[PDB]
Design a protein around this ligand. Structure first.
Ligand SMILES: Nc1ncnc2c1ncn2[C@@H]1O[C@H](COP(=O)(O)OP(=O)(O)OP(=O)(O)O)[C@@H](O)[C@H]1O
Ligand SMILES: Nc1ncnc2c1ncn2[C@@H]1O[C@H](COP(=O)(O)OP(=O)(O)O)[C@@H](O)[C@H]1O
Ligand SMILES: Nc1ncnc2c1ncn2[C@@H]1O[C@H](COP(=O)(O)OP(=O)(O)O)[C@@H](O)[C@H]1O
Ligand SMILES: Nc1ncnc2c1ncn2[C@@H]1O[C@H](COP(=O)(O)OP(=O)(O)O)[C@@H](O)[C@H]1O
Ligand SMILES: [Mg+2]
Ligand SMILES: [Mg+2]
Lengths: 145, 1622, 128
């Protein structure tokens, strides 16, 4: 169950989804939780006094923001998502994200096109590291592109 | 006897005029002829009012006044009757035609039945006696309608959930407001009333065509008159209910257009791939079909020709028939170009313009295809083009047309678009089409982004109109929340309409994240349509919106347009951004847009004109100076280009009009040959660009014009007709009119320029410094147009920043989701509804106030070509053509390009309004308007002749004004603040002469004495009006400058400034010192709050305050805290009876609502025939609002103080808007006085120049050393009469007081600590403190006097000090000063360092030994432990001093304490212990995690009742931690200063308070029954009994910030720095 | 205070580096028709106003740091920026690279005024 956080109804839905999930092993993902720093503190206290199902997982999506409470950060395990360190890492991430059956369809030339796209996507993204020379501006070339 | 005839005519009209009755469905007899009734009543009301001016009105005064009452009563009744009858009609239809509502809402249905019974009963009475007078005499008919209106409104607001149910049955109702929907549902039989609502539910359907019966819908029509006739008409009889035949109309609109398209495609194919086109046949085909289908047919034919040509080129080397496709386009475009070179019908001409724009693009695409040697239909350069495939063999007519771009395929929606202006199809627009259609195929949203004026919104609509979709534009703001967006999505999804959300990043970031969930679920539903496995004969696709299953039409789409460069905007979360495909639209192709538009309008030299106009705009943006009101973007270019076509059409009409009276040589083809096309373009540029230019840019732009358009001259039309009316209106308004270089000529040009902008723009700004003539320019123009054109002009003036943005536009209820209109929304909706003929009048909505992006960007869709006010409830209000949106502002330093580019600009400079013009206006009014309410006018006229020489250009006043601007003033100096002050003072001088004539009925003042008085008073008035806000040195310097240049006789003293002289009524200079006697003050009034010792400054300031106050002119006293501003104002008010002062204490958090509570308590709102009037409750009294800190209220990030804008509105407009009912309220007998510290002081903001022009400022400085000696030497002489043996020491005691006070004021300043302010207030407390310690004493040695003097100095100067060094300095210099002025005294007995005074060991306040005091406090602490608080305390020396300091404050009236120190130092415990020793009850608010503002208000009521009604002495001890909200201190700031909170007791609380006050005052023996008298006694009890102790920790940032939030904490509370334990 | 003495030297030094004179271009009937004059007139007009404002603000800061005029709200805001080394927002009138500090702006502003003086000197002595 995926929930955006900003709405007042989102807070009510998040609590019900979490309460249902902790008794069934269901997964809950809450996105943009950095937009509600005050509610995040109350969620950390709620999670502390809880013994959910062994399969239950709670995912919190946020930007890297100083508003995120320290107490929540200590209670959870942090994973940083950022541009891949280089061309090799960028292209390996691309080939893992795209299912194999996607590339391996009937036209055999489809595989080389995806490689060219992966190389092109890596070169364009890596040039952003050179803020001014690679591109005049810091464009958000990303996964959607 | 002409007056008698008018009365006879009025009597005869109303003895026969009957309410015109019509049967309504055999139920009652409604009333028509509202226009006839209202105009007839207004006509007699004006005639009765006008005949009062006639001198013969006295004989018929009573009869005319009787008719004024009757006519006013007729207006008040039928203005309510019309709204009651209107509401009953559609409510009766709903509660009769839908039996389901009776079960759904039984309570409302029965309640409506009861009201519907009383309405029908009153209808039957009207039927018996339809005569208006008989209806007017029906008992309680006025109150019956008032109850009917209120009751019917409650039923209306109770049908909201029923309306939400009907919106599902016809989803286009989701875009209609609740009231309009009730009109639609309830009037389902009266179809003629449905016509005004179709523009809200349809893209281009403005009305429907009906048969004579109104039972069959024959077709639909657009706002321009274009009609679509249905192939199969829709019968309303066979489908009676509103939502089914409306659905059938929507379907027949789509089916008819598709059938009409097939017929059009058949004919247009003949024109395609044809060598020659006959214009008559082609024009016939254009006229036969609708504008949207004509362009659609042309696109279909061109696409199939290219497909045919590319198919033949399959071999590659085969000959190219693409040239024939180009050839056909060339031939067709030549016929279109020839057609627009001559006169055409307006609908056909626009159709021809659309075809030219379409074919120019087809010509460009075909040329690109030929140049690129494309020979295959599957080539991407052809697939990337937008193509149109038509299959006549397709069975479903709605799917015969397929629009394909790249891989994206679309069906045509066949929404009737009417005649929508098309965009020039530029390469940027081509790229926009490709990107957005890729997003549509991917079931993603489109996100065009870029700076303002790049075509983002128009391109989205153009693409939607290309696909035949209903495109809805929403001007988003922060009020578009999750619930509002979802409901809009529900309407969009079911209708199948496109949502273009502009300024989408103006939503809050939390709302953007929440909305992303709704956008995603719709997009998943959209992909279910695209699934080939899904079959149309199955369950409809549905997504979950707002916890409901909502059907999704495949045609709906979501688009967001944003300016990512605007600072302060919300950043979109990434999960939302992945749902949209973004395209940068940054550089519009201006030269192509200009070339195609000029070519489509018929300009033969369009290529030459486009190559000049587009670079010219580029040059203007760089060659001209930089101004915030300058725009040379695409909107400005588009405005000129559109105006160019309008100017070309009028010249052609003018040329042939000359030909009608000169021969019969109409040769239209040759008429276009000799047509100055360049001169036409220059006229459009000058009519649109010139009014925005500053003076030094005007020659620059004409040099640029000569550079790009050589030999082309601009000549304005000499508008004699308008200028004659303007000249007459100026005469009636005492204004100066000029022509050319005459006086007032520049201003008249700006009025004419403003008129030109009103004819080209529906939104315009008048920008210029305060006092530039902007207001008079549009007020005079509005009246002149009424006389010239016969159309009544109505102006609604709004101060947008004087109210909250919620009160300007409205609010959506968080829970009930009910919409309440704001001020602007209510005004615009009233004009659209046109209940009282507002659509036939010129309606100007003037936003007079500051412009900031927060509120004006809600008008982006209003000010652009959309002309729509979009509300978060989904409602869209169209701007009627008779409405102009105007913005009168002094600057645009916070407006963004988005706003500036969307509005016509007229720039006013301060040179436009010359000082000679202002002088003429003052003299003209002085010679015509009597000041008394003629012997008074005769005095003014003679005085005007005397003043006239000095008010000429380069006269005394002009030279004085120029010199004054060179001086330094406590506030910023503006021309109108000086002249406004100067004219008020001169009016008082005229009143002085009249008052003298009253004193001398025998010998009135002669001209020689009148001349002798006026000249000196004018000099006197000039000095105070131009330097009264400056220091003495600046006041002096203006004196010598006047002395050099004036010829008025002046005082001949060698070194006495002129400002030191008044003007006696005998026309002689008299020194102000003659009115400053050395008084002896009664010994019991020593340093009392009401006692003022006359000084040179006090008598001058009081006289100046008297003049401004007597004229009801708002004024501000400015000076350092404690300089005597309140003292001087209240002293002047004592000499001015019939004026009640009410003190308001502004803080940083003060809003207009503080003023409104004061109005609620002291004033009443009364309904008058001319509107609501707010007047003081007490009759015959002028109520003075005294604001003590008028420049503390918080300035927002856009430089605006809301309360200041509110006060400016009440002064300049004489009123304000009541936000509850959106009604203008007029003030009567209410004036304003301000007090403040200099704006350079911390926490103080400069006052707006638009507020200062009305408010003269007097500077009250601290009294000098000699003035202080005179003031407190008088007090010391009186107080030392208690002990006759101490009379000799009066002078040294005063000298020591002044010396130490001056030294302390220099030593400690606000730079070190924010509370280091020393003023004569300390001197007043110093004398009072000594006096209180001397009253019960029969005798005292001089050493005893010094000890009291030293003790009070420590309490007043040392107790606030923070540092030990500062306290050491104060302790040392007290000894130094005392021995300097008191030699031969025993130092030890008088200055022993432990100086302690107490009344605990005796009856009197006498010195106490430290050890004796320690034993007493231990003895009392023992009792305190057993009775109040068993917390043992260790007694050290500082505690003994502290408890004595707290004891002093609890024994003073309004004794408030500010205890500052570290937590746990005993501040609260000592306060409770001293409170228990003085008999004071301790009150502490019992805060908790859920303690809120209304909990604090109830707690405040409890304490005030006990101390105000029960005479209970209370120590209200409250800590800084108790302040859980800033609103807590706004209440305490008022309570500390005034002992009252104006809005704390309301409703039943006030009624209970009055009962308790009456009981409380009875126990005191006072005879009080009046509520006002009871409230004053209650305030006086709170003043003497309530003691507030404020405890806070030392925080440097917190303490400085604390002063602005609660200035009363630092000037009404005694501060004791307990600090930390030493 | 230590800041009061250090800021006094800096402001006095800046008044030495920054030039003091900038004469507006004399508008003439045939100078208005010259495009170069039209652009160059704008440069001095906006340049002269900025030059006077900065010099006046710096002179007030020096006088404040000598204890001769009382600190106003504007001076308190300006003095706080100068202590922190942030370029005052009032001084910012021509576009500059982001992250430019006040010490570089004063040197940059001084060079721009010198060029503005030479342009006006040529127009005054020699014509447009
Ligand atoms: N044409 C005129 N001839 C004579 N007096 C004029 C004329 N126009 C304005 N005035 C007077 O000069 C002053 C100008 O006030 P006006 O309201 O026109 O200025 P404004 O620029 O709209 O003001 P603000 O900036 O405060 O909104 C008023 O005292 C007005 O009576
Ligand atoms: N391709 C075009 N052809 C004609 N007029 C255009 C074109 N693009 C933009 N305009 C005009 O430019 C102005 C600004 O367009 P608009 O869509 O409001 O811009 P934005 O949404 O970027 O602020 C309008 O007058 C609009 O009609
Ligand atoms: N001529 C005077 N006669 C009596 N008191 C004076 C005189 N001049 C100054 N004062 C004292 O100066 C103080 C001014 O208080 P107030 O009028 O409230 O000041 P402000 O309005 O400037 O804050 C009072 O203590 C008042 O008694
Ligand atoms: N003079 C004192 N001797 C002993 N204990 C004290 C003394 N002053 C304060 N305390 C202790 O500190 C506590 C807090 O006192 P309180 O008046 O609430 O402090 P404050 O108002 O400075 O925060 C008291 O309850 C007491 O235990
Ligand atoms: Mg837009
Ligand atoms: Mg005005």
């Amino acid at each position: 169950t995926s929930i955006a956080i900003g709405s007042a109804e989102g807070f009510n839905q998040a609590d019900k989804a979490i309460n249902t999930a902790v008794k069934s092993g269901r997964w809950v993902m809450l996105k943009n939780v950095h937009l509600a720093p005050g509610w995040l503190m109350q969620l950390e206290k709620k999670l502390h006094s809880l013994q959910p199902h062994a399969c239950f997982r709670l995912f919190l999506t946020m930007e890297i923001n100083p508003k995120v409470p320290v107490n929540l950060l200590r209670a959870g395990r942090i994973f940083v998502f950022e541009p891949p360190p280089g061309v090799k890492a960028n292209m390996l991430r691309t080939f893992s994200s795209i299912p194999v059956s996607r590339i391996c369809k009937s036209p055999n030339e489809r595989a080389r096109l995806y490689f060219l796209l992966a190389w092109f996507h890596a070169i364009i993204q890596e040039r952003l590291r050179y803020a001014p020379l690679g591109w005049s501006k810091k464009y958000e070339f990303g996964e959607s592109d | 006897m002409a007056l008698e005839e008018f009365l006879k005519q009025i009597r005869e009209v109303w003895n026969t005029y009957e309410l015109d009755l019509v049967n309504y469905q055999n139920k009652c007899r409604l009333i028509r002829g509202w226009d006839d009734l209202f105009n007839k009543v207004k006509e007699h009301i004006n005639s009765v009012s006008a005949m009062k001016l006639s001198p013969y009105y006295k004989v018929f005064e009573e009869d005319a006044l009787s008719w004024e009452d009757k006519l006013n009563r007729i207006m008040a009744l039928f203005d309510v009757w019309i709204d009651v009858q209107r509401r009953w009609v559609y409510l009766e239809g709903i509660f009769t035609g839908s039996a389901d509502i009776k079960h759904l809402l039984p309570v409302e249905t029965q309640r409506f039945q009861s009201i519907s019974t009383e309405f029908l009963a009153l209808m039957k009475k009207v039927s018996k006696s339809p005569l208006v007078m008989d209806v007017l005499n029906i008992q309680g008919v006025q109150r019956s309608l008032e109850r009917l209106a209120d009751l019917l409104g409650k039923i209306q607001k109770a049908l909201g959930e029923y309306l939400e149910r009907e919106r599902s049955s016809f989803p286009r109702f989701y875009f209609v407001g609740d009231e309009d929907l009730l009109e639609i549902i309830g009037n389902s039989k009266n179809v003629a009333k449905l016509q005004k609502h179709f523009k809200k539910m349809f893209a281009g359907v403005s009305s429907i065509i009906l048969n004579e019966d109104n039972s069959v819908v024959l077709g639909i029509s657009s706002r321009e008159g274009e009609e679509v006739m249905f192939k199969t008409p829709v019968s309303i009889t066979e489908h009676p209910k509103i939502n089914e035949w409306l659905t059938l109309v929507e379907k027949e609109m789509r089916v008819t257009l598709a059938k009409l398209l097939a017929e059009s495609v058949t004919e247009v194919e003949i024109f395609g791939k044809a060598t020659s086109i006959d214009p008559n046949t082609y024009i016939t085909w254009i006229d036969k079909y609708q504008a949207q289908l004509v362009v659609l047919s042309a696109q279909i034919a061109w696409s199939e020709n290219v497909e045919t040509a590319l198919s033949s080129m399959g071999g590659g080397g085969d000959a190219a028939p693409l040239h024939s496709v180009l050839s056909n386009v060339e031939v067709t475009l030549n016929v279109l170009a020839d057609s627009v070179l001559m006169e055409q019908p307006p609908l056909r001409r626009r159709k021809l313009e659309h075809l030219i724009t379409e074919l120019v693009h087809q010509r460009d695409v075909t040329r690109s295809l030929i140049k690129s040697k494309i020979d295959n239909a599957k080539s991407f350069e052809w697939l990337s083009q937008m193509r149109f495939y038509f299959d006549p063999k397709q069975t479903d007519v709605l799917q015969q047309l397929s629009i394909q771009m790249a891989n994206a395929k679309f069906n045509y929606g066949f929404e009737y678009l009417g005649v929508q202006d098309k965009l020039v199809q530029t390469p940027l627009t081509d790229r926009c089409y490709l990107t957005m259609t890729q997003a549509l195929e991917a079931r993603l949203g489109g996100s065009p982004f870029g700076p303002a004026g790049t075509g983002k919104t128009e391109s989205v609509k153009a693409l939607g109109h290309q696909l035949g979709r209903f495109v809805l534009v929403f001007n988003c703001d922060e009020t578009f929340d999750f619930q509002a967006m979802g409901r809009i999505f529900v309407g969009l999804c079911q209708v199948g309409a496109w949502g273009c959300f502009d300024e989408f990043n103006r939503l809050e970031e939390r709302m953007l994240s929440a909305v992303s969930q709704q956008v995603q679920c719709i997009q998943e539903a959209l992909r279910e349509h695209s699934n080939p496995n899904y079959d149309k004969t199955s369950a409809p696709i549905t997504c979950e919106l707002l916890n409901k299953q909502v059907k999704v039409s495949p045609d709906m789409a979501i688009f967001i347009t944003m300016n990512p460069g605007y600072a302060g905007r919300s950043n979109l979360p990434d999960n939302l951004k992945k749902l949209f495909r973004s395209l940068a639209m940054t550089k519009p192709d201006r030269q192509l847009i200009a070339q195609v538009m000029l070519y489509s309008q018929g300009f033969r030299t369009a290529e030459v004109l486009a190559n000049k106009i587009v670079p010219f705009f580029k040059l203007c943006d760089e060659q001209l100076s930089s101004q915030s009101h300058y725009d040379f973007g695409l909107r400005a270019l588009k405005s000129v280009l559109v105006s160019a076509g309008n100017v070309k059409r009028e010249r052609i009409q003018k040329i042939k009009r000359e030909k009608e009276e000169r021969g019969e040589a109409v040769d239209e083809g040759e008429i276009a040959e000799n047509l100055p096309e360049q001169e036409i373009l220059i006229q459009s540029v000058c009519e649109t660009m010139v009014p925005k230019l500053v003076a030094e840019d005007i020659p620059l732009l004409f040099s640029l014009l000569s550079d790009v358009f050589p030999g082309v001259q601009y000549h304005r039309g000499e508008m004699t007709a308008l200028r004659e009316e303007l000249k007459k209106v100026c005469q009636e308004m005492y204004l100066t009119y000029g022509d050319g270089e005459e006086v007032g000529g520049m201003w008249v040009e700006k009025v004419l320029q403003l008129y030109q902008i009103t004819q080209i723009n529906h939104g315009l700004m008048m920008v210029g410094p305060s006092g530039s003539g902007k207001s008079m320019a549009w007020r005079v123009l509005l009246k002149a147009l009424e006389r010239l054109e016969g159309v009544e002009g109505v102006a609604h003036i709004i101060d947008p920043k004087a109210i909250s943005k919620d009160h300007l536009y409205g609010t959506l209820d968080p829970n009930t989701r009910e919409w309440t209109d704001g001020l602007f929304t209510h005004v615009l909706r009233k004009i659209i509804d046109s209940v009282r003929g507002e659509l036939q009048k010129r309606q100007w909505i003037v936003f007079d106030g500051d412009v900031d992006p927060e509120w004006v960007e809600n008008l982006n869709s209003v000010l652009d070509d959309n002309k729509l006010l979009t509300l978060p409830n989904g409602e869209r209000l169209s701007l009627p053509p008779n409405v102009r949106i105007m913005f009168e502002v002094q600057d645009l330093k916070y407006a963004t390009l988005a706003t500036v580019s969307r509005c016509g600009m007229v720039w006013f400079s301060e040179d436009v309004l010359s000082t000679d013009m202002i002088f003429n206006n003052f003299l003209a009014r002085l010679r015509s308007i009597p000041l008394d309410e003629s012997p008074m006018l005769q005095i003014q006229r003679d005085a005007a002749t005397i003043m006239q020489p000095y008010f000429t250009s380069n006269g005394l006043v002009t030279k004085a004004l120029e010199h004054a601007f060179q001086l330094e003033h406590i506030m910023d100096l503006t021309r109108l603040r000086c002249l406004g002050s100067l004219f008020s003072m001169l009016h008082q001088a005229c009143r002085n002469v009249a008052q003298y004539n009253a004193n001398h009925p025998d010998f009135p003042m002669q001209i020689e004495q009148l001349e002798r008085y006026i000249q000196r008073y004018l000099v006197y008035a000039i000095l105070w009006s131009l330097s009264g806000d400056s220091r003495l040195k600046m006041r002096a310097e203006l004196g010598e400058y006047i002395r050099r240049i004036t010829t008025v006789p002046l005082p001949t003293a060698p070194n006495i400034p002129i400002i030191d002289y008044e003007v006696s009524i005998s026309g002689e200079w008299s020194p102000w010192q003659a009115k400053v006697p050395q008084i002896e003050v009664e010994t019991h009034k020593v340093a009392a709050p009401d006692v003022v010792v006359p000084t040179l400054d006090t008598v001058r300031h009081e006289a100046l305050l008297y003049t401004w106050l007597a004229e009801h002119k708002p004024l501000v006293l400015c000076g350092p805290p404690g300089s005597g501003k309140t003292m001087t104002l209240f002293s002047a008010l004592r000499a001015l009876p019939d004026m009640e002062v009410v003190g308001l204490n502004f803080s940083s958090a003060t809003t207009p609502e503080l003023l409104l509570k004061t109005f609620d308590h002291y004033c009443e709102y009364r309904r008058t025939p001319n509107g609501v009037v707010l007047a003081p409750v007490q009759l015959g009294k002028w109520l003075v609002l005294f604001c003590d800190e008028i420049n503390l209220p918080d300035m927002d990030k856009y430089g605006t103080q809301r309360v200041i804008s509110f006060i400016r509105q009440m002064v300049e407009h004489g009123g304000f808007y009541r936000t509850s009912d959106q009604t203008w309220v007029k003030l009567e007998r209410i004036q304003f006085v301000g007090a403040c510290n200099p704006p350079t002081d911390p926490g103080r903001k400069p006052l707006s120049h638009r507020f200062l022009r009305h408010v003269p400022v007097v500077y009250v400085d601290y009294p000098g050393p000699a003035s202080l000696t005179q003031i407190y030497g008088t007090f010391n002489r009186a107080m030392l009469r208690l002990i006759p043996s101490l009379r000799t020491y009066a002078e040294p005691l005063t000298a020591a007081m002044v010396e130490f006070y001056t030294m302390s004021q220099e030593r400690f300043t606000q730079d070190t600590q924010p509370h280091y302010i020393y003023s004569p207030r300390e001197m007043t407390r110093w004398v009072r403190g000594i006096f209180e310690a001397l009253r019960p004493l029969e005798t005292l040695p001089v050493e005893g006097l010094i000890r009291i003097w030293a003790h009070e100095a420590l309490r007043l100067f040392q107790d606030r000090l923070v540092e030990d060094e500062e306290r050491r300095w104060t302790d040392e210099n007290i000894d130094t000063v005392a021995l300097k002025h008191f030699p031969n005294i025993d130092r030890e007995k008088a200055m022993s360092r432990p100086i302690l005074y107490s009344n605990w060991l005796s009856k009197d306040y006498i010195p106490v030994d430290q050890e004796e005091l320690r034993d007493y406090v231990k003895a009392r602490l023992k009792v305190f432990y057993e009775e109040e608080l068993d917390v043992p305390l260790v007694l050290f020396n500082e505690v003994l001093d502290h408890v004595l300091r707290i004891d002093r404050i609890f024994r003073q009236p309004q004794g408030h304490l500010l205890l500052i120190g570290v937590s746990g130092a005993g501040k609260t415990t000592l306060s409770r212990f001293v409170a228990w020793m003085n008999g004071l009850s301790v009150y502490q608010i019992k805060v908790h995690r859920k303690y809120t503002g209304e909990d604090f208000d109830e707690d405040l009521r409890t304490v005030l009742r006990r101390s105000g009604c029960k005479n209970e002495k209370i120590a209200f001890i409250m800590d800084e931690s108790n302040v859980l909200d800033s609103g807590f201190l706004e209440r305490m700031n008022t309570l500390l200063a005034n002992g009252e909170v104006p809005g704390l007791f309301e409703g039943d609380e006030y009624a209970t308070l009055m009962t308790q006050c009456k009981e409380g005052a009875q126990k005191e023996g006072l005879m009080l029954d009046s509520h006002e008298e009871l409230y004053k006694w209650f305030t006086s009890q709170v003043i003497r009994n309530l003691h507030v102790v404020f405890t806070m920790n030392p925080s440097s940032e917190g303490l400085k910030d604390r002063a602005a939030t609660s200035p009363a904490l630092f000037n009404r509370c005694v501060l004791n720095w307990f600090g930390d334990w030493s | 205070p230590a800041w009061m003495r250090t800021l006094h030297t800096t402001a006095s030094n800046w008044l030495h580096l920054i030039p003091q004179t900038l004469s507006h271009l004399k508008r003439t009937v045939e100078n208005i028709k010259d495009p170069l004059f039209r652009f160059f007139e704008r440069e001095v007009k906006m340049g002269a106003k900025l030059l006077q404002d900065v010099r006046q603000d710096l002179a007030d800061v020096v006088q404040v740091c000598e204890g001769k005029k009382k600190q106003t709200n504007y001076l308190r805001t300006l003095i706080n920026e100068l202590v922190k080394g942030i370029l005052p927002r009032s001084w910012s009138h021509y576009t500059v690279p982001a992250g430019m500090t006040v010490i570089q702006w004063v040197s940059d502003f001084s060079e721009r005024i010198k060029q503005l003086q030479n342009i006006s000197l040529a127009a005054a002595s020699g014509g447009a």
